[PDB]
Design a protein around this ligand. Structure first.
Ligand SMILES: [Zn+2]
Ligand SMILES: [Zn+2]
Ligand SMILES: [Zn+2]
Ligand SMILES: [Zn+2]
Lengths: 359, 363, 357, 366
């Protein structure tokens, strides 16, 4: 213990802990809202299974900085599930795509996401057009880097389907069911592996599906909205609009509690509120009106270890100065000679360091 | 601090929202200074420019930069004009976050985006933005049901990437000019903002080129890519020696090249960015610049701020809220619902669970 | 609003806001425990009144970094009140003393603190021996800088006194009353000024005095201990020792609620617990069992604005890279030491030329 | 592997890494100035040797938050060496003393420091009067916790002695030599163990002793002052006083260069400056005028691993929300011989809280 490693550490240092064969690790890489802030990236979850499979559920704007702090090689993070096509649920897919490829991902991204009520409201269309949006980046990068990693294979599934299997691979099952939020399309996921069940709610008004299909989850994640008082205080909403937000549009803390009392998970996770010194306590208290079981109030870099005997909540202590960590056909140039003729002579300036570096 | 009860003047840090901008002043905040690889210390390239006439502009809005921009306490409606140097993810990735975020938070005007063409339609900004709006069609259509759709538009102003120091923007005595960069493939540009005797230059991404030294000449603030050392490229990224040497000569502007460029420009103040600014990277990069450039220099990091006045170009750090909220500034019900009855029929009765707080709140 | 200042800002930027003549600002500069943490300095409060007076109540180990982030000239913070002589309540007095002096505090520090049951248990004895403890620092610094600011004038008051005035100047009154904690000496304070009453509880097991003398405070601060469950989980304590800690030694969250139910303050402040993602919630719940009124769960750099109409909680956003801000004898060397100098003219010659021109 | 630990990590996670039997780890738990700042605690160094020994060299105001972030049990950090009796070099000794003792530390603290030109300018007096300063804390704590860990045993050494052994145990040698700062007493240390030599400069204007006794250290830590231009911009100082600060009083970046040129250490560490985005660069340029060897510009939580083949600089990434971590410890009972420090006058004031605490109290006993 003098020279040796401190065991069972009270914080999670990403890349410092072996994952056991009968264990799951879940890390919140975004817990926040459609509005950006350094304290909270938009919705993103990393799941690491003891079998060695790793999934991303949601990759909202700003979450890539949290994901990259985990010291996980890009080739282990190629399978992404989207609950919804909000920018705060998949905005950083383009950063995973582009950054991973420049940083040695060799395999394409695999993306599972819902359909909508028509083609242009679904995940296939969305990813297809994101790729065209970044055509300049794709074509220029593809000149100097083999484009195989630049492909995104989309597995779109019917948003309407009630607890149907959307993924079955290597003893891992993902089921989806609908959400009620903004318009048709958003879903929740249940990940089933090795007698474990992890539920990723996504975004919804309270629904009849989640309480049924999430039942007995080892870890149950659901949206848990800021209070009507907080909507008045913070967003300057009139009393009636603030009231409606927690009845019509979203799952209230009180509703979240009803739902988790119905679900009886080993551990419930509230997320998708601004987790501030002046907001969290009314939200936690709303939940405890109706649910008394183990509860985590999520913020960025919270981590859950799921074992047979426990679901433990810790905070990740991860590097702000993050770096990519290493894992184990002719194309047309996109330059004209008009541009390449612009090169400045810098032979003189670079001479000293160049002679020293080659020696 | 002249009084116990009163405001400390000329504060050594910049608190966003706490300072009046003078009529002959420019404020520039680095909202991202980093790389195509994400990290909490450094968002990807983003700049906020505030002029004394009340005009504000974003130059680049790379992945991760929106949290920094939101920490500035500037109403969404004042940040509608966005200039892109390149169509890399790490230069316009967070354009979508600004578009959706500000629209939810009460922006009332459409976004306005100036970006370069490419060699053909599908390599320029008009095509890029059109397809980004299609990519987020679900979010657009669902949000347009409950929020007026007008601020969900993006007006694109595409300009010729080939043009040598020509105007791309002219409004209210503010000029932006572009000239080309040499980077990845045709399209990327540098910008010069001219207003009220001032010239601010946003370099973007380039191998050393003949245009910047001429067109950036005498800028109040000159920003230019300044790459990590070949030795770092080896130490960090385990690059095989020759690759590491070619990166700092052919692909990017080395610190030494940046020095030559800024010695030619003779700016009032020069800014190196686009490297990982760490306790074991920054010093050799600095030394590299000083080989050739002796003038005023900032080694940019996130939330660094420059005040440009007639007498000085000041560098300070911004001290800004991590727990940021949108700040308020000064609905077409003839839209088809994007719900079907099938999904609406799924609602859980939660009347009991919510009655307690619901009674109380209606007092 | 484009060119202009953002009004009524949602965070407090220290040095950015004028205090009105009927306003109080209280900043928690330390909310923690006798064990150190970058997240929570030990007990320290800065109070700013609209009449321009400023006070420090407690200055525990680690709090000086928070106090220095406030951009307050050292000469404005010369008056310090100590609730108790725990290192986690006055450990940073020496940092304020030495730091302020080198940074151009011109006036001596003034310290109000309790006596104990005998001379060697009181503030007078403590500060006299603190200055001897740092006599090398004192003597060497005094050679180069005038020693007036290096004086500490101690105002020891009787710990036993029941709600008596220990300070009265410029319309500001502090009263003390005793606490029940560790041993005889610890006290709570009440600052009264311009119809406002701010209570600094210090450290206590629940006592009959605080509920009486704190009644109707604008801001009531009281110890609010971590739970007997948190005591076993975090300190591997035996169940019965973990039970006693929250009944005999300290104020339980539940006791805190009872006390604040009795006090009926405009705003209650719970502090002196580790404010963590897995501790804070049970502490809040315990309080809410008995207290329903406005409550803050304190952490470092929380700030309250006390006005006629409101008591507001905000977080302060302050510089980590802090600098002192300007407000408006025989050598201790022997020749044997001054002889050891290394010549460095050559090495320093280049810059010495540039600088002088 | 997807399942395994990432090896040779680019940041140090305190408590995550086994220390090699022929390895030294040095952590800057404080690198700053007489004035306080969240970014930089005052001068403090933690040194872990492969043999299991650990030492603290300096424990300035603010450093204890950093030291506690290391997940080291209190019982392993009972040996402290002071280079000077400045508040910003030993201010947090008291925090260590009180906090460890409450945390469950069972060994007294052991303090090594310099004498001065007379009794009341040396460490023995300083620590004696520090214990008297905290007499209320001592006597109240000694009622409920065993008093033996509350002792501080002082080993005062002669400040004038040129490179003499002030500590010698378990194959570890500490030597001291003088410095030229503020007045007589402040020293530098050299820690020698298993063919390694680590030097803690302390504070000094440039001296003849450092370059001689520091020669060929694996890690050489020396004061390296902010620039005279920086003294003018920051502290509004006049030109001549600004100039004098870097010549008369402190080691300029340029002098630091000369000294490390002369010492030729494996790795040089510059510290004791405010490490800001607008100060660090000129200070680095200053050192490079005369020193070309491996250099760290120190800031808080910077860590050096010293091995036969390399000296590696990493940043430690450590918990802000720190907790004491348990290690080996005695279950020493409180001394019932000790008088209570309560009088019946104070005890008579207890409020009845039976009711408010009965709900959670019952449930807790179930
Ligand atoms: Zn959402
Ligand atoms: Zn770039
Ligand atoms: Zn206390
Ligand atoms: Zn010092």
């Amino acid at each position: 213990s003098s020279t040796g490693i401190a065991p069972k550490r009270y914080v999670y240092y990403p890349g410092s802990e072996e994952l056991g064969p009968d264990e799951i690790r879940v890390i919140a890489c975004g817990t926040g809202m459609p509005t950006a802030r350094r304290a909270q990236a938009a919705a993103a979850w990393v799941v690491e299974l003891g079998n060695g499979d790793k999934f991303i559920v949601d990759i909202g704007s700003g979450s890539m900085a949290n994901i990259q702090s985990l010291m996980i090689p890009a080739n282990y993070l190629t399978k992404i599930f989207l609950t919804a096509l909000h920018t705060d649920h998949w905005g950083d897919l383009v950063s995973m795509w582009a950054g991973g490829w420049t940083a040695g991902r060799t395999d394409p991204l695999e993306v599972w996401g819902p359909s909508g009520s028509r083609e242009d409201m679904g995940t296939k269309y969305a990813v297809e057009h994101m790729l065209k949006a970044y055509n300049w980046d794709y074509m220029t990068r593809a000149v100097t880097i083999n484009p195989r990693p630049g492909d995104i294979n989309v597995h779109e599934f019917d948003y309407r389907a009630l607890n149907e299997v959307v993924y079955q691979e290597n003893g891992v099952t993902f089921r989806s069911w609908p959400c009620i939020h903004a318009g048709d399309g958003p879903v929740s996921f249940a990940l089933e592996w090795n007698g474990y069940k992890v539920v990723f709610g996504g975004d919804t008004a309270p629904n009849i599906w989640y309480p049924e299909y999430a039942k007995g989850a080892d870890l149950a994640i659901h949206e848990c909205w800021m209070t009507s008082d907080q909507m008045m205080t913070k967003y300057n909403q009139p009393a009636q609009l603030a009231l409606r937000i927690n009845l019509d549009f979203h799952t209230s803390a009180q509703s979240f509690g009803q739902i988790m009392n119905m679900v009886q998970p080993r551990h419930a996770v509230a997320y998708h509120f601004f987790n501030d010194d002046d907001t969290r306590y009314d939200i936690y208290t709303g939940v405890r009106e109706n649910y008394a079981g183990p509860l985590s109030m999520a913020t960025d870099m919270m981590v859950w270890n799921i074992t047979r005997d426990a679901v433990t909540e810790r905070m990740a202590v991860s590097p702000d100065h993050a770096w990519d960590v290493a894992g184990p056909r002719n194309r047309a140039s996109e330059y004209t000679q008009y541009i390449l003729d612009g090169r400045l002579n810098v032979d003189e300036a670079n001479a000293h360091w160049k002679q020293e570096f080659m020696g």
